[PDB]
């Protein structure tokens, strides 16, 4: 229990910076929504922008708490106080709904707040999972009960399938963040006992080029050396869960889209069938690079490490991480003018790019902007202005989280190589 305390007080500055950035983002979402609310929803202003701006000063106060020595003692409590406040504001914003707001706007709030609770607030797993699901079940319950009929069975299943996707991504994001945080602390701990961040903010590469080059092939040489899967952060085993997560996210997100139709276009069946065929093959390789059954030969191994290379993995991982995105857009046709479902579903397709932490964050985040958010944006070409603000906020969260988890998995590898280096000495 003392080593977990020691881990906490060493990792606490990361939790400080993480939580502080969430306050800046939550206020930015509140500020941006206020400006949009003040122009396209002038019918009810003092009730729709006042809670949004009142939360702005709350974030400043929560920012003020951060420098206080009392926050250093109970930072878990401080994050809990914000989480309920952000929960209450978002359900309140969903309580009310020219005088109407699209559902995708509310769904972005539900998704964005959930990702904050799971990834940036450092609450316990049981608290984050139960509080998140309780918020998700209350978000859906309030919407179905407090909906407006003036403007707007299997539908209920679609909500759980969609909300199941984010919780799966959120818990995977939180678990991966925890195991890398715990592993990095131990390995620098072993490094300091053996003796007795070199990452540029922009490009996210090790400042030492030799370390950068060995980083790229590290997963490749992991397969060639056939390193046994030791912990949850092993590069080969880490790949298995993200490939697994891409399977579940794509399966359910495709299940919802097929639920709306229950004739699907031949483009819908073709992309899903290829996606399932690629997913089962990609999933099979992930379990085969980890478990290495007795049926293995050298011929199949040679292509196994070949895939593990830096470039080809980004070639296949880009398709894999985007496969939920192409699943949604295979269900669109010329009869688009239907739009609420794809917008809500594409909200999770762009969310899914937070997966595959091994891949470069810049590739995944840009793919989300270009292939997971872009096709819906120019398809529309105020609902149009809303989805622009909706996807900008979610992408901004996706872009930032990919930045934070990449440097986490980068610094985890830095701790391993130094710990491995000190073991050879």
Curated annotation (Swiss-Prot):
* Domain of life from the UniProt record: Eukaryota
Q: In which tissues is it expressed?
A: Detected in skeletal muscle, pancreas, lung, heart, kidney, liver, brain and placenta. Expressed in multiple cells of the lung, with expression highest in airway smooth muscle.
The protein's location, in the record's own words, is: Cell membrane
Q: What is the effect of changing residue 224 to M?
A: Found in 37.5% of the Asian population, in 30% of the Caucasian population and in 16.3% of the African-American population; reduced adenylyl cyclase activity in response to stimulation of the beta-adregnergic receptor by Mn(2+) agonists isoproteronol and NaF; increased albuterol-stimulated adenylyl cyclase activity in the presence of corticosteroid
| Extracellular-side segments | 42-44, 143-155, 260-266
Transmembrane spans: 21-41, 45-65, 75-95, 99-118, 125-142, 156-176, 239-259, 267-287, 316-336, 338-356, 365-381, 382-401
Q: Which residues lie on this side of the membrane: Cytoplasmic?
A: 66-74, 119-124, 288-315, 357-364
Q: Give the UniProt family note.
A: Belongs to the adenylyl cyclase class-4/guanylyl cyclase family.
Q: What does this protein do?
A: Adenylyl cyclase that catalyzes the formation of the signaling molecule cAMP in response to activation of G protein-coupled receptors. Contributes to signaling cascades activated by CRH (corticotropin-releasing factor), corticosteroids and beta-adrenergic receptors.
What is stated about domains?
Answer: The protein contains two modules with six transmembrane helices each; both are required for catalytic activity. Isolated N-terminal or C-terminal guanylate cyclase domains have no catalytic activity, but when they are brought together, enzyme activity is restored. The active site is at the interface of the two domains. Both contribute substrate-binding residues, but the catalytic metal ions are bound exclusively via the N-terminal guanylate cyclase domain.
What is the protein's given name?
Adenylate cyclase type 9
Q: Which species is listed as the source? A: Homo sapiens (Human)
**Which gene is this protein's source?**
ADCY9
- Shown part of the complete sequence: 98 to 1020 of 1353
């Amino acid at each position: 229990v003392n080593l977990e305390e020691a881990c906490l007080e060493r990792c606490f500055p990361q939790t400080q910076r993480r939580f502080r950035y969430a306050l800046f983002y939550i206020g930015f979402a509140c500020l941006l929504w206020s400006i949009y609310f003040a122009v396209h929803m002038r019918s009810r202003l003092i009730v729709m922008v006042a809670p949004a701006l009142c939360f702005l000063l709350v974030c400043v106060g929560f920012f003020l708490f951060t420098f206080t020595k009392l926050y250093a003692r109970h930072y878990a409590w401080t994050s809990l106080a914000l989480t309920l406040l952000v929960f209450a504001l978002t359900l309140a914003a969903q309580f009310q709904v020219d005088t109407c707001l699209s559902q995708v706007g509310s769904f972005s709030m539900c998704i964005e707040v959930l990702f904050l609770l799971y990834t940036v607030m450092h609450l316990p797993l049981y608290l984050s999972l139960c509080l998140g699901v309780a918020y998700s079940v209350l978000f859906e319950t309030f919407g179905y009960h407090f909906r407006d009929e003036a403007c707007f069975h299997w539908e209920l299943l679609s909500r759980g399938l969609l909300h199941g996707c984010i919780h799966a991504i959120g818990v995977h994001l939180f678990v991966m963040s925890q195991v890398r945080s715990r592993s990095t602390f131990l390995k620098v701990g072993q490094s300091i006992m053996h003796g007795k961040p070199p990452i540029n903010q922009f490009s996210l590469n090790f400042l030492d080029q030799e370390l950068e080059r060995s980083y790229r092939t590290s997963y490749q040489e992991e397969v060639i050396k056939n390193s046994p899967v030791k912990t949850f952060a092993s590069p080969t085993f880490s790949s298995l869960l993200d490939v697994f997560l891409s399977t579940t996210v794509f399966l359910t997100l495709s299940t919802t889209c097929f639920l709306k139709y229950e004739p699907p276009p031949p483009a819908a069946l073709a992309v899903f069938s290829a996606a399932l065929l690629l997913e089962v093959l990609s999933l099979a390789v992930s379990i085969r690079m980890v478990f290495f059954l007795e049926d293995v030969m050298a011929c199949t191994k040679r292509l196994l490490e070949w895939i593990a290379g830096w470039l080809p993995r980004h070639c296949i991982g880009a398709i894999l991480v985007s496969l939920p995105a192409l699943a949604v857009y295979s269900h669109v046709t010329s009869e688009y003018e239907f739009p609420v479902f794809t917008g809500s579903a594409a909200l999770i397709a762009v969310v899914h790019y937070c997966n595959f932490c091994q891949l470069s964050s810049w590739m995944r985040s840009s793919l989300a902007t270009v292939v997971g958010a872009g096709p819906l944006l120019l398809l529309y070409v105020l609902i149009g202005q809303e989805v622009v603000l909706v996807f900008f906020l979610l992408l901004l969260l996706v872009w930032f989280l990919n930045r934070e988890f990449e440097v986490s998995y980068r610094l985890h590898y830095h701790g391993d190589v130094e710990a491995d280096l000190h073991r050879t000495k």
